[PDB]
Symmetry: D2
Subunit: 462 residues, 4 copies
């Protein structure tokens, strides 16, 4: 049972919009919206959405496993050895938010302060004394973005597993010699840094120039969660505010995925005429180039929707019905929709590119979708007595931590190793005002709900 199975199960359920039925549904953790900071839903005038892994959640492990195959095939085709062809995606290995250390070739799970929670070299989990040889303070400086790359999005799950596979392969294949910073193959030296850059380029190539997009769209039911409650939520949003789409994808791919997402023999609810996906948005923006979009952006262009190409030049006109934009900046959205940052609830899956930057640069309200939450809630419930056991204790602590972490996968929970929160958890708490396994969870809260978090107090104020 992947998280995307939980999501698709919930997606198959029709919406019961009775006030008491809604209220008891959002009792279950699966269907709750979680609050880091109070947000009064009546003050929200625009709802904005991202597409990939937000509106269009890809099925797991099938989609990761497709991207993994195509990235391997790309690497083999530029000269990596054929043995790579015998790797196969294992979803039980990668957890999201790991850090790849390009100097030494390790995947690290760290807390908000750069302290090491887990260190794996290939598939070899390194323990305290051995880690201290490479990390003498058991700490890394995350600001060293030339050395450390943070594998933040669900698109990075294939490459997280692939780096481990590759380091394991070259370490154990007797053609190569392992050195501190890479592999020697006769007179060629492959550093973990340039290996990492190859994987990163191959992933980029597969999305921009290979066959990932074509293969997804030819089998949409296989690859993409679909939910008849989406047009219902969006039309309800439109009754009280404006709705916008902002995606890093191009128009042609967005049109295919979005058409699929709305492909029901009805519109908002059973019995209603179907309407085109575009009719649900006051503003549609493609090729956004987030996070840059939240700074100086790029030039605002207009899409020619007949052909899927950009019209030539910068668009200088007003918002018109049926127009599709490309590029621009977050200011374009505020200006064309007449909104201030705090009037905007932006719903996205990318902790950095969607959530952190819209919050820090623009003061937008934020909703983080976390697809793995669908499954991590289920593990957190039926391992309560395991977390609670660890909680009491605070040697046996190291053992408890281990079997707690293992239920989630080899790299543990997305949110913690034992009693220590991950970097990713702190940034969720820090930047996401609201968060949930799915944005559909908003459907179960009334129009003007006040989401509440307890006021925060310093230690001396308590």
């Amino acid at each position: 049972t992947s998280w995307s199975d939980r999501l698709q199960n919930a997606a198959d359920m029709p919406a019961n919009m009775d006030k008491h039925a809604l209220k008891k549904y959002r009792r279950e953790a699966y269907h709750r919206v979680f609050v880091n900071r109070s947000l009064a839903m009546e003050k929200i005038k625009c709802f904005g959405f991202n597409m990939d892994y937000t509106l269009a959640v890809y099925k797991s492990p099938e989609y990761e496993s497709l991207g993994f195959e195509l990235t391997v095939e790309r690497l083999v085709s530029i000269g990596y050895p054929q043995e790579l062809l015998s790797f196969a995606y294992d979803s039980t290995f990668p957890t999201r938010g790991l850090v790849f250390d390009t100097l030494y070739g390790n995947l690290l799970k760290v807390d908000a302060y750069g302290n090491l929670l887990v260190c794996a070299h290939g598939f070899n989990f390194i323990r305290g004394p051995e880690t201290r040889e490479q990390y003498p303070n058991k700490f890394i400086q995350r600001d060293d973005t030339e050395r450390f790359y943070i594998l933040n999005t669900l698109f990075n799950l294939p490459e997280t597993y692939l780096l481990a596979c590759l380091v394991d392969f070259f370490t154990n294949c007797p053609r190569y010699t392992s050195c501190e910073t890479g592999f020697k193959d006769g007179d060629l030296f492959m550093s973990y840094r340039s290996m990492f850059q190859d994987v990163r380029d191959a992933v980029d190539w597969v999305h921009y120039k290979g066959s990932l997009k074509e293969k997804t769209v030819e089998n949409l039911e296989k690859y993409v969660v679909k939910d008849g409650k989406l047009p219902l939520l969006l039309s309800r949003m439109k009754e009280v505010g404006k709705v916008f789409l902002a995606t890093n994808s191009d128009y042609k791919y967005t049109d295919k995925i979005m058409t699929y997402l709305f492909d029901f023999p009805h519109g908002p609810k059973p019995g209603s005429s179907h309407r085109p996906w575009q009719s649900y948005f006051d503003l549609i923006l493609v090729d956004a180039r987030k996070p840059l979009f939240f700074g100086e952006g790029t030039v605002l262009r207009q899409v020619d929707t007949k052909t899927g190409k950009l019209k030539i030049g910068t668009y200088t006109g007003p918002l018109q019905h049926g127009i599709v934009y490309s590029g621009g900046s977050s200011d374009t959205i505020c200006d064309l929709l007449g909104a201030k940052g705090k009037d905007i609830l932006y719903i996205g899956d990318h902790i950095f590119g969607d959530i952190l930057k819209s919050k820090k640069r623009q003061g937008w309200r934020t909703f983080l979708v976390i697809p793995e939450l669908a499954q991590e809630l289920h593990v957190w419930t039926d391992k309560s007595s395991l977390f609670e056991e660890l909680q009491s204790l605070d040697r046996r602590i190291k053992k408890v931590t281990h079997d707690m972490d293992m239920c989630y996968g080899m790299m543990g929970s997305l949110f913690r190793s034992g009693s220590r929160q991950t970097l990713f958890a702190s940034q969720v708490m820090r930047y996401a005002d609201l968060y949930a396994a799915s944005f559909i969870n908003l459907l179960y809260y009334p129009f003007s709900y006040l989401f509440r978090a307890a006021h925060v107090l310093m230690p001396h104020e308590s």
Copy 2:
């Protein structure tokens, strides 16, 4: 009753080192060490200290008021009008941590997200609708360090008041015309930006080239809190670890202040021979240039203590008894003292230069000294029923906020406006593992105390 009066009152008390007496003393909030993250004191192998506003706390309002006088006199001497001579420091106006907006000339108190809590133009406190003309989202982007300057240290209190004085003066003096971004005086235009830069340069000049240092040292009892419990704490630290001094000051000024701090007719405790301040430190480092010190630093130099000048060239030798260093980097300290970051407790007053950067770049443990805490605790206790009143309510909320804030000063508490925490409070909670009104508060905790904070839980984990 300034905070420095509270501190000096506590400083006048001899140390009663009876176990039960220590224990009940640290019951009082004034004498407590507050914990943001757990810290096991037995794992600490080096204690490091900063000097200004940490070991050497300057008396308030007298020292701020001296710096204010000298900065005014500097500005008049380069051509500011003589009316400045009639400003006088008012300690009830500035709160620490304000932001000066150089575009529009406002002092702002903001939260961690850049939301506006208070906006003052000169001495005119701007309310919601008027602020929205210049701040349409009531939010500023703190990353815009060219526009916004954060007045973070206790050294900035004079200039915080001075900017307000200056904006008030030019606004109301009919020789000048007020524009959005500055003042017109015939054919001269003075922007708030270049006005701000003048004040900043004048402050710099007074510390580096004027008479602030000479006037402080000629009346040390007037300007500097002194405490016979300091050599006691430091000698106790030395029994279990190494002790180091790292200051941005030069040697000559440090020698004068430190000699004064230890000037008692005894050493660690009454009856013991006096010893030179230098004997209390394993390592003394001046001209540190923090925060840069916590990155690439500068070249390690050696002070000639006979003359107070640097010897020529880079010092390449080992740690020797009686040597005084200048410049270097935090790595110099780790290497010469044989420590890893987490073995180091660094005690400082500068949230950025001491605390944030040693934590983020190096993984040091951190103790933030907050001198105003001596007084803010006293206000927080006898206005409990005023905070608690506000707490219940959550119109009357706006009124409660106001009379809560006013008890602290015109710019409110250092930690909050009402129910909204300031930027400075969040960074304390974020970067300072421990914090107190004074580092002397450590004296009241046993050698191997475990400071405890409750493990943190996400909303879905609760």
Copy 3:
């Protein structure tokens, strides 16, 4: 009669290596090597060559005209209007070395000081008073590389003509409105800057991703000058030194062009066995990335010549027989060939990327190939009495200038407008120790010839 016709005519001649025959051949200007600074050929230990427009000279106007077609077709395919399909390359318009001003959309011919010699907007040649409206000092700052792009290589001839075509088209087509800095088309604004960037991207695309390479190689006799005296020159060079190839092209394209260049039923001279092009070089380097190659370069890679792909990793081995490199830096060549800069004669066609940078950064000796020289010599000879007329005079001067310039083309000679040298001429004189219509001209000078230039004297030394 294009310059490539002159070159191919000379190429068809067999080499007569009799001492007196060589000597009288290099009497003719067509076959001379010209000297800016003295160079003693006996001190040269390595001869290095670039490939495109140096060893492999493309036929004119056919190759420019092919690149022009494909760039137009690329632009139409991303959305430029179909009328572009009716442009056709005119070789009489562009001269090499022009500057495109992206602010105002003009092509400029300038001197070494940035003074304007010619200004054309589309096909409209602007005269003094009108130019002064946009260039009030009749001068541009060439260091403003964001505004001004210098169209330096023979690869830029198509785009030089295309920019003029495009500016002429949009100016005269009544769908668009001409503004100072671009064209308005309803609510789209196309700036000359973003238009320029489109052309530049299209040219890049045609070379990297389109069909220019495939179409050249399928009709090599149509597109590329071939000369049986090339293997003769190279084998003679090899008798006295080392020979190397350094190209920005990839291996596969270099292998096709070079195989073609050596495709004769003989080797160095008639009667000798043919040998593979590779046997003529001590060192072959592809994907050089000049000019960066002359600074920090990139990582030295090794080509797999079976497949045409790079082997994985950085090459750490020595120079071996038959190995082909990719990337690296100029230091790689010095180290593997055991040369110092001044031992190296580097032969190239790119004034900046080949000549200027090897001279300034490394102290290499330089030979600039200037294909248009084949024809400009012919114009300079039979318009002697026209230059000489202008020379005497120094109103009629403006008229003489005009009909002098016109014999070369609409944008005049590559080297001057009348009595004023171009930027390109000064940089030739400044950076190219030697220069010629072809590097084959070296064949006509003995092994240890001393090329002589008169010592230079300041005005007060004369």
Copy 4:
């Protein structure tokens, strides 16, 4: 006989303004204006002047020798050893335009291409084979401004000699150990780089904070060439155009030097009333900060001439009679005087800061004053048969070079070593349209003289 003796001798002569007398005076090389590019004096509408070493030429060796003393005294006062007190300025050692190599501690004389003409380590002149150990291609990359500092102005003559003195001292004093890149003194390592930076800082300190200015002004006849023909030239310029002053000095120092320069009991010519120096300029600009002045400049300020301080704020008014400016940019001058670049003749002594940058960034016409030319002309005349001997020859060549160079000093002529022009000579030829031993030489040419240089021809055009 220093060059300043030649200049002061010529300065003592009254002006004979008879047409035939002027004409035969400018026959002598001492009184000629030399032409690199043609300049029609009638097209010049503004004459601009720099002050130091242009209008105010300091006497040699006395002024260099004063700056040398004060820089030594500064270095000793921060801790350099007392032996420095026994250095004494030797004017026969330094030539202007040398390069200090901070890696190895050598002074180099180079040509325009970075080729080594002379290499001295302290006072030890290194010959070919020994130089090749540190410079294997006998070439340096001048663009490496972090390694190489070019000692371009007459203000740098003291420090050129001082670096040599210092390297000689530490090399031969047995307290220090010589390494490749500096000196070891026990546990202190002094690199040539940080030694160089000390000298540079000391020179800066002496000009900005020490006693050089005070000591010059208290003995103006000792330190500064004065010439009654200056007000005559300037008033004649004012009859046909505008005249401006632009200096890097402050107002107070400029007022003292300029008052001195005009201190005659008459104005333009004997018998005329004296007028204040300020009356000779349409525009006076101090604190120019050239070369930055020729790019974005700084904010235009107005000097308060009563006090010598800046008025507060940016000056927004027009040009008014009697106003003195500070800062600004070259555009300020063009706008306030209504000039285009080519209407401006700018007269300066700094090859980079005055001449190169006004020419390259703005298209100004340029006149370089070269005080040493007064003496180098005298050496060039009575060593004609020595240069001419070298000229014919082109072993004995190395010997001729040596005794040619020696007549100028230990570092040879400013313009050449033998038959090889220096960097400084090429930049004179490149950037200075006109040049002379003194700007007063303009007095001897009529109002509308056309200065002529022969049109330049490429080798293939000849």
